[PDB]
Structures are given as structure tokens and as C-alpha cells.
Design a protein around this ligand. Structure first.
Ligand SMILES: Nc1ncnc2c1ncn2[C@@H]1O[C@H](COP(=O)(O)OP(=O)(O)NP(=O)(O)O)[C@@H](O)[C@H]1O
Ligand SMILES: [Mg+2]
Ligand SMILES: [Mg+2]
Lengths: 337, 19
């Protein structure tokens, strides 16, 4: 049963939520190999755990940069939630710790690369290809939302492809446990729901909107709202006009009209029927939800894998010296990390 | 084409989150 599974999942989550894991490794236990991705203020590096020989992906956050960008509470949210969740399509946090300068989150290394890079290279995914990935996000949001979690940064750049061709969601940077509504302007411009842009107070329905944008971008090769600058993107989003490529199927367009829906009383995922309005939509008719969950469905493609610590599926980045300090920075702000 | 327009735009690379 779904109710039985979710009831057990919530019990599991709450135990870890209430007593988070803390300080479970240290920096000199890893060799830092190569940068896998860099943002405005996070760096993720391929590392090798010396004692086990395992490769991991280590997210490094400069505490001082976190403070300057007013991301303290978000970063605490990020680690507290990621350490507490457990789902087949969520990246696993193995260790976390901090030093004088930085915060560290050590995840399983997902070697297949970002969905983003494959999507840009191939141009677009076929509808069945897009559906395979979309099904996994649907189940993932069902899991997250049941725990009163909002994810808040769905995009191809935060979705990794594993050795079996399945999705691993990374970047819990804006994840938040909230029962009521919330107000923070965060996400990625192309993926923001109108209510975020318009400072209205919003809820988990923004994740469903974001799913609409994701499906569109996967199937079209480009987002439904694009421009050179964020402000121009926001105008298009608030406008609530979406044009679909002529190759889009009738079922796909209908589903997207219901996800990319400005009216919250009408947006799929947010109605009385909740997630089942999406699961039961004609576009997903060929989807076997249990088989997706159990990872028994054949993947559209398997990424190339040359070796245990191969980074071929990732762009190269300029390397930077790790921040180091003789004195502890921002001790009080990150005491719980 | 919309695709050509996108490909010529300034946001075809990895997009950073905003806060
Ligand atoms: N577990 C992982 N395995 C392999 N690569 C990863 C992993 N986690 C993250 N990455 C890569 O590192 C990048 C940055 O990680 P992410 O957690 O998205 O950082 P961020 O600073 O919060 N980025 P954003 O908020 O989207 O601007 C991702 O886009 C992936 O390319
Ligand atoms: Mg990210
Ligand atoms: Mg992030």
C-alpha cells in the first residue's frame, strides 16, 4: 500500500529529522580529485575516501560566503533534510562535517553527469524518454511532499543520471520543511512559479509548476519561458502564455496546460485528488508506477562509464584553493551543522 | 525557429539558482 509505505517513510524521516547525524568524517580522510560543478557559492568535487577506496561527491560551502548571501538557514535546511531522507531517486548523503572555513556534504558520486548536459547535447528527449524521467520526479515529489518538504529547485542541472540510467536528485539547497505557506524568493529563474515572482506566499504547488517546466524543456529542447535576462523571463512567466512545439502530442500539451497553470485552484498536484491527477493523466497511461519505483523499467540510455572515478560525463572547471583559516569562522551560525 | 532563438540566447549554459 502507498499509505502504508508513506506512513513508515515518515516515521523513518522524523527520527533522523529530530536527531540529525553530525560530524561523521573529516577533511583529511579524502583526497580531492577534480571539480564536478561550481555555482555562485557552492563547489562540488570528486573525492576519494582513503580508507575504503570509494569515490564520492563532496559539496564544499564557504561559511563566510553563505553568511554574505544570507543562506545560513537554507544551508542548515539543506543538510538537515538531506541527511534525513531515503528514496530511490534522491542522492544519498554519506558524511557531513565542518572545519574552520567550510561546510562539507559528502554524497554518493553519481557518475552519469547532469541531465542538463545530455539534454543540451542531444537537443531534446523523445516523449517516452521525457516520461521515464518525469515519472521519477512525480514519485519523488509524492515522497517529499508527504513529509511536508518543498524541494524548490527542480531543473536539469540538479538531476543526475546514475549507472542504470535512473535519476538522482541532488541540491537540497532550497528544501524546506513547512506546513503552512512560505515566502522566500528562491529557485532558478526559468523554473519559478508566478506566485514566487509576485511575492504572494506559496506552497508545494510550486514544485508541480516546476515539473511542468522540466517536462516542457525535456521534450522541447528549450524552456517554455526564456530570454537573455531573468526580469524578461519573469514577465513571460507571469503573462501565463505558453506556446508548444508542433511535435508535442495532444496528451503532453494537455498535461502541461494543467501543470503550467497560474490558477492554484486548477493546477495539477494541488487539487483535491493531489498527485493522482498527474499519475492518472493520459500522458502517463503507459507508465507503470511500481516498476519505476522498483527500478525494473528499461532506461532510455545508460551513460558511458570508463572507470570508478571517471568524470567524462561532466564539464571541466577551473580549480580553486580550498578556503583555510587558522581561526574558526562563523562558529555560532553553524553550530548545528 | 524557437529553437534557433534559444540557441542564440545568453542562457543556454548551466543556470545558477537565485536567492
Ligand atoms: N552526488 C553528486 N554526484 C555527482 N555530481 C554532483 C553531485 N551533486 C552535485 N553534483 C554536481 O555539482 C553541481 C553543483 O551541485 P549543487 O548541489 O547543484 O550546487 P549548488 O551550489 O547548490 N548549485 P545551484 O544552487 O543550482 O546554483 C551539480 O549541478 C552537479 O553537476
Ligand atoms: Mg544546483
Ligand atoms: Mg543549490
Amino acid at each position: 500500500s502507498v499509505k502504508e509505505f508513506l506512513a513508515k517513510a515518515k516515521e523513518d524521516f522524523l527520527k533522523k529529522w529530530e536527531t540529525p547525524s553530525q560530524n561523521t568524517a573529516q577533511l583529511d580522510q579524502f583526497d580531492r580529485i577534480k571539480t564536478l560543478g561550481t555555482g555562485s557559492f557552492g563547489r562540488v568535487m570528486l573525492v576519494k575516501h582513503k580508507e575504503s577506496g570509494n569515490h564520492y561527491a563532496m559539496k564544499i560551502l564557504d561559511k563566510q560566503k553563505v553568511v554574505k548571501l544570507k543562506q545560513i538557514e537554507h544551508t542548515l535546511n539543506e543538510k538537515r533534510i538531506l541527511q534525513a531522507v531515503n528514496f530511490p531517486f534522491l542522492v544519498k548523503l554519506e558524511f557531513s562535517f565542518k572545519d574552520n572555513s567550510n561546510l562539507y556534504m559528502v554524497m554518493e558520486y553519481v557518475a552519469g553527469g547532469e541531465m542538463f548536459s545530455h539534454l543540451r547535447r542531444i537537443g531534446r528527449f523523445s516523449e517516452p524518454h521525457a516520461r521515464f524521467y518525469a515519472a521519477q520526479i512525480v514519485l519523488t515529489f509524492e515522497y517529499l511532499h508527504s513529509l511536508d518538504l518543498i524541494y524548490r529547485d527542480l531543473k536539469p542541472e540538479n538531476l543526475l543520471i546514475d549507472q542504470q540510467g535512473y535519476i538522482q536528485v541532488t541540491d537540497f539547497g532550497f528544501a524546506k520543511r513547512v506546513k503552512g505557506r512560505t515566502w522566500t524568493l528562491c529557485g532558478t529563474p526559468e523554473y519559478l512559479a508566478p506566485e514566487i515572482i509576485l511575492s504572494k506566499g506559496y506552497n508545494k504547488a510550486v514544485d508541480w509548476w516546476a515539473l511542468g517546466v522540466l517536462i516542457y524543456e525535456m521534450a522541447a529542447g528549450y524552456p517554455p519561458f526564456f530570454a537573455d535576462q531573468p526580469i524578461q523571463i519573469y514577465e513571460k512567466i507571469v503573462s501565463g502564455k505558453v506556446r508548444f512545439p508542433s511535435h508535442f502530442s495532444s496528451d503532453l500539451k494537455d498535461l502541461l496546460r494543467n501543470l503550467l497553470q497560474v490558477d492554484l485552484t486548477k493546477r495539477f498536484g494541488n487539487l483535491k485528488n493531489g498527485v493522482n491527477d498527474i499519475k492518472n493523466h493520459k500522458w502517463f497511461a503507459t507508465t507503470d508506477w511500481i516498476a519505476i519505483y522498483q527500478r525494473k523499467v528499461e532506461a532510455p540510455f545508460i551513460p558511458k562509464f570508463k572507470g570508478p572515478g571517471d568524470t567524462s560525463n561532466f564539464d571541466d572547471y577551473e580549480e580553486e584553493e580550498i578556503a583555510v583559516s587558522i581561526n574558526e569562522k562563523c562558529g555560532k551560525e553553524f553550530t548545528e551543522f | 525557429t524557437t529553437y534557433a532563438d534559444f540557441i542564440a540566447s545568453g542562457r543556454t549554459g548551466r543556470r545558477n539558482a537565485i536567492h
